Design a protein around this ligand. Structure first.
Ligand SMILES: OC[C@H]1O[C@H](O[C@H]2[C@@H](O)[C@@H](CO)O[C@@H](O[C@H]3[C@H](O)[C@@H](O)[C@H](O)O[C@@H]3CO)[C@@H]2O)[C@H](O)[C@@H](O)[C@H]1O
Lengths: 304, 298
């Protein structure tokens, strides 16, 4: 299989960290020096990493059996298909949200004999001591479902930590999957802008975020539909970087040069400390040009 | 350019009518006589039909500005990116849910200055006279948001119609958009049955319980829209293959209109007994005359 990227306009594709349409590209010197997102993580040759699903249907979802304990109610986690989650292996079940150091307001439904609004639960997952998805359990506040009830849970909105240790939401940080007790195993690796003057390209989507450092915006490193594409093709990586053009869909005019690294993320060079890809139209298409050296100097993108 | 289907296990893919993992395949001698789903509709050469999005991020969502009326408040619809929705182009905004003749229990959030639980609204959309998706407005009960508030709404669960004209939910039926639709699909003959990819979904009193049928995995839609492979025959012959063992588990024909058929053994359950972790693989272009080996138990 020759390497390719989807011929789909960027603004028809999803964020890989929340189920929301991409509406912007951005670079961030402050937040973009190192990222370790666990969702939207895949190699150019199709190797899934972290908690990354193939399908958006699994993204920002939790499944578990309800427990009632002295310390609070919560979920003994399963995979979304109900199959057993193997603790102390993956950071969390596949599709588990990777937005750290904030409150998750979520919606849960009974997977068995759903009768209506009494089988829908608005719950709050805090990232405190009892948040231990790597050990196979999280505590949920305002969870009234009976013990051993099987629940599928969707992320509704995120807000600053209940315990008031910070007053804003940083979507650039990932959860402590093993709580204070352990670093989680099989984390997708840290990513850094590799090349000369290069900045990691973040695909931005709007999401209900209370007091976001970037407002109601969530960054990711790859459109979700790109993940399914790479997992499908399993195309061999034949060079150090894939040179892409971001092209006008109608004229095929090259609007900018980007490098995709084997680690499954994309860089650009901004125009003399400009906003880089932020000023580009969002209806464009990425197109594979050739395999290039990691040293390949990208022509600056965007306005000065 | 050679036609292909995604080399991805079905159980890792989504329904194209609800955002839920595929957990079964089925045929139906009652429900599969005619289908006209508006989501999961695409040609094998990659032409989107009905309200079908490329991305699951657009599926089963509604966006609109709140209006207040004496008959009931509601939404003047936009597309999900917030751009204006025009009638006469499509049956409804892209990704508009296509589960007919039932109550839609939905969660709306403010797209501007989201403050928390006071900008999250649990609303009810009935399919009655004030349901006008084609015109670009729907009535919503239990909606307290201010006039002209921009809301993005997702489907939470479905239940029997409020006006009680029926006491079950049939997810095989599509909504009345007005008086543009992706065309009807029929079984083409010789015992060929339309394959339905089933996903679990909160459904109160479902005719098939808590199950939603579609004709394509969502990720197949994005694949065809990407590839745009010329259709070179009357049907794409597929093998449903164990990705480990590489063993052919059964034969299927995918038609240019973007649906699959199989032939059940002795009027049995057809693909229902097959494992759900298999992958479809393109074998060749065949004629309508190609007779599929029967699949399943009797
Ligand atoms: O502050 C971040 C949290 O905001 C929201 O929760 C807050 C909300 O539930 C209000 C409702 O009045 O209560 C807050 O707790 C207060 C409490 O009201 C005071 O009496 C007490 O002295 O202080 C506490 C904490 O400062 C509560 O924080 C969201 O729902 C949460 O997810 C957080 O984002």
């Amino acid at each position: 299989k020759p390497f390719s990227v989807p011929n789909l306009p960027l603004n028809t594709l999803s964020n890989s960290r929340v189920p929301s349409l991409i509406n912007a590209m951005m670079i961030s010197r402050d937040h973009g020096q190192m990222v370790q997102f666990q969702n939207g993580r895949v190699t150019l040759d199709g190797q899934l990493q972290g908690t990354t699903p193939t399908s958006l249907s699994q993204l920002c979802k939790i499944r578990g059996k309800v427990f009632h304990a002295s310390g609070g109610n919560g979920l003994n986690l399963t995979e979304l298909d109900g199959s057993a989650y193997h603790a102390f292996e993956s950071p969390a079940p596949i599709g588990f949200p990777d937005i750290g150091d904030c409150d998750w307001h979520m919606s849960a439904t009974a997977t068995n004999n759903f009768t209506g609004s009494s089988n829908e639960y608005q719950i709050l997952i805090k990232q405190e001591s009892a948040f231990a998805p790597h050990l196979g359990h999280v505590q949920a506040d305002n969870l009234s479902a009976g013990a051993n009830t099987d629940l599928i849970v969707s992320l509704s909105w995120i807000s600053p930590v209940s315990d008031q240790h910070r007053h804003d939401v940083d979507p650039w940080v990932i959860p402590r999957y093993g709580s204070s007790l352990t670093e989680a195993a099989q984390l997708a690796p840290p990513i850094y802008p590799p090349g000369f003057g290069e900045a990691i390209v973040f695909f931005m989507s709007d999401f209900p975020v209370v007091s976001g450092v970037n407002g109601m915006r969530i960054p990711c490193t790859l459109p979700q539909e790109y993940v399914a594409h790479f997992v499908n093709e399993q195309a061999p990586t034949r060079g150090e970087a894939a040179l892409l053009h971001y092209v006008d869909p109608d004229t095929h005019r090259n609007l900018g040069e980007f490098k995709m690294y084997p680690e499954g993320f994309m860089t650009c060079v901004p125009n003399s400390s400009g906003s880089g890809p932020q000023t580009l139209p969002i209806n464009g298409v990425f197109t594979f040009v050739s395999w290039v050296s990691r040293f390949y100097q990208l022509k600056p993108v965007g306005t000065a």
